[PDB]
Curated annotation (Swiss-Prot), chain A:
The chain holds residues 570 to 663 of 2184 of the full protein. Residues 1-14 are annotated as: Amphipathic alpha-helix. This is Capsid protein VP1. It is found in: Virion; Host cytoplasm. Interacts with capsid protein VP0, and capsid protein VP3 to form heterotrimeric protomers. Five protomers subsequently associate to form pentamers which serve as building blocks for the capsid. Interacts with capsid protein VP2, capsid protein VP3 and capsid protein VP4 following cleavage of capsid protein VP0. Forms an icosahedral capsid of pseudo T=3 symmetry with capsid proteins VP2 and VP3. The capsid is 300 Angstroms in diameter, composed of 60 copies of each capsid protein and enclosing the viral positive strand RNA genome. Capsid protein VP1 mainly forms the vertices of the capsid. Capsid protein VP1 interacts with host ITGA2/ITGB1 to provide virion attachment to target host cells. This attachment induces virion internalization predominantly through caveolin-mediated endocytosis. Tyrosine kinases are probably involved in the entry process.
Length: 94, 254
């Protein structure tokens, strides 16, 4: 993708809820080991019987760009109208 | 065959008959149906009790009198005690349903009088004491008719039920914009409004939100003459339609 070519996106929506039925089995999606360093990729349908929901939500404003690309104040500086003699007639910021 | 005055409505283990109806109003043109996979948000499987919930519940009927100003009921709250609908509404955070509302009122060729029967969505009522706030017990007696007042005043946090402003700061003669019928004793003995789920959000809590209010207001006063049957009641029977519930936990109020 090219972060400088602004007018060139990628629409990625959120994940849908797939319908789950009742179960009685040897597979255990919610029993795991935190020690691994892994995060559980469980979905509610592994624990409950869910309906079918279509999530057209998009993770728009949480994009690094939308998050950082809002103009913030970083510093303000002060200076008077004066002569060479007046130290305060100009100013600087590192 | 088939006189259009005669009607038979069956829902669950319930049939209502009428031999003097004036068609039936389907609220805003839409027949009730279940929440679809596109419009859904609560991810859990809904319970849909069908016939056990979706049946005809007759609420406490009121008496129509010559000077009686009017009545209102609030839904789904009026049904909070009606059988398994009430239970489902009690054990679930979210509920959704449409309703077949059937108001009954019979009198005689010699009696006269005319009532507006209307289903008002989001009928948010004003406090009588404009300075203060209203409260639940003066907003709804569940299945018992809350009355409209001819009198412009009421007890602490009572609604301003003065009939000509319909309890909500508007002209009662304009209530007709909402799904409505009229029981004019000359013409008919019943009214039937099939109300869809009208709300800004797919499901809602059954207690917190009174999704709509049933108002029965007499525009032409009940009258009859010399010894011709005084008692003439108005009975409201209502059936939930396409009822489904999400978010199950313990018995609920707080």
């Amino acid at each position: 993708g090219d972060v400088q070519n602004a007018v060139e996106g990628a629409m990625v929506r959120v994940a849908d809820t797939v319908q789950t039925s009742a179960t009685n089995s040897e597979r255990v999606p919610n029993l795991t080991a935190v020690e691994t360093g892994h995060t559980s990729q469980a979905v509610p349908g592994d624990t409950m019987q869910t309906r079918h929901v279509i999530n057209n939500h998009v993770r728009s404003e949480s994009t690094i760009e939308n998050f950082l690309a809002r103009s913030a104040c970083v510093f303000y500086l002060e200076y008077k109208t004066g002569t060479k003699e007046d130290s305060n007639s100009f100013n600087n910021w590192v | 065959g088939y006189s259009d005055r005669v009607r038979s409505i069956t829902l669950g283990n319930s049939t209502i008959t009428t031999q003097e109806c004036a068609n039936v109003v389907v609220g805003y043109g839409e027949w009730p149906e279940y929440l679809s996979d596109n419009e859904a948000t609560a991810e859990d499987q809904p319970t849909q009790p069908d016939v056990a919930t979706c049946r005809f519940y007759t609420l406490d009927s009121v008496q129509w009198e010559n000077g009686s100003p009017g009545w209102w009921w609030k839904f789904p709250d009026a049904l909070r005690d009606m059988g398994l609908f009430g239970q489902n509404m009690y054990y679930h955070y979210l509920g959704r349903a449409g309703y077949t509302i059937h108001v009954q009122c019979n009198a005689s060729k010699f009696h006269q009088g005319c009532i507006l029967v209307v289903c008002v969505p989001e009928a948010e009522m004003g406090s009588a004491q404009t300075s203060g706030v209203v409260n639940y017990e003066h907003i709804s007696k569940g299945e018992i008719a809350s009355r409209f007042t001819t009198t412009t005043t009421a007890e602490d946090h009572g609604v301003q039920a003065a009939v000509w402003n319909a309890g909500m700061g508007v002209g009662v003669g304009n209530l007709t914009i909402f799904p409505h019928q009229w029981i004019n004793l000359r013409t008919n003995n019943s009214a039937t409004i099939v109300m869809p789920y009208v709300n800004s959000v797919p499901m809602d809590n059954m207690y917190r939100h009174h999704n709509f209010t049933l108002m029965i207001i007499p525009f032409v006063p009940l009258d009859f003459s010399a010894g011709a049957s005084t008692y003439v009641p108005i009975t409201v029977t209502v059936a939930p339609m396409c009822a489904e519930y999400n978010g199950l936990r313990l018995a609920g109020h707080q």
